[PDB]
């Protein structure tokens, strides 16, 4: 898998989720207790990328959250959690 996190300084944009992966934690893939709202960086929310899914990239229909365990361990305090595809290009998958 050629997938990393963005991990840039996140700003005031809010992450979205498509309807497949809707109630998951963007970090640990859990469904128990969504706690903290996800912020993304300004580059990952731009132009045609505005409003896409943080996890997969599809059309977003709800807000993305950190679960309670990640909030307790302070995993919301790293960079932008958008998934980046290194094996392909920008307008690719």
């Amino acid at each position: 898998p050629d997938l990393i996190f963005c991990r840039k300084q996140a700003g005031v944009a809010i992450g979205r989720l498509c309807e497949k992966c809707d109630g998951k934690c963007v970090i640990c893939d859990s469904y128990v207790r969504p706690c903290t709202l996800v912020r993304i960086c300004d580059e990952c929310n731009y132009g045609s990328y505005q409003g896409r899914c943080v996890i997969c990239g599809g059309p977003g229909v709800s807000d993305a959250y950190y679960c309670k365990e990640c909030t307790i361990q302070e995993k919301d305090r790293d960079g932008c959690p958008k998934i980046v595809n290194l094996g392909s290009s920008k307008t690719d998958l």
């Binding site: 898998p1 050629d2 997938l3 990393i4 996190f5 991990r7 290194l86 094996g87």
Partner: peptide, 10 residues
């Protein structure tokens, strides 16, 4: 390029 080797480098 994995997430795990990106975490360890950060």
């Amino acid at each position: 390029y994995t997430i795990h080797s990106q975490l360890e480098h950060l």
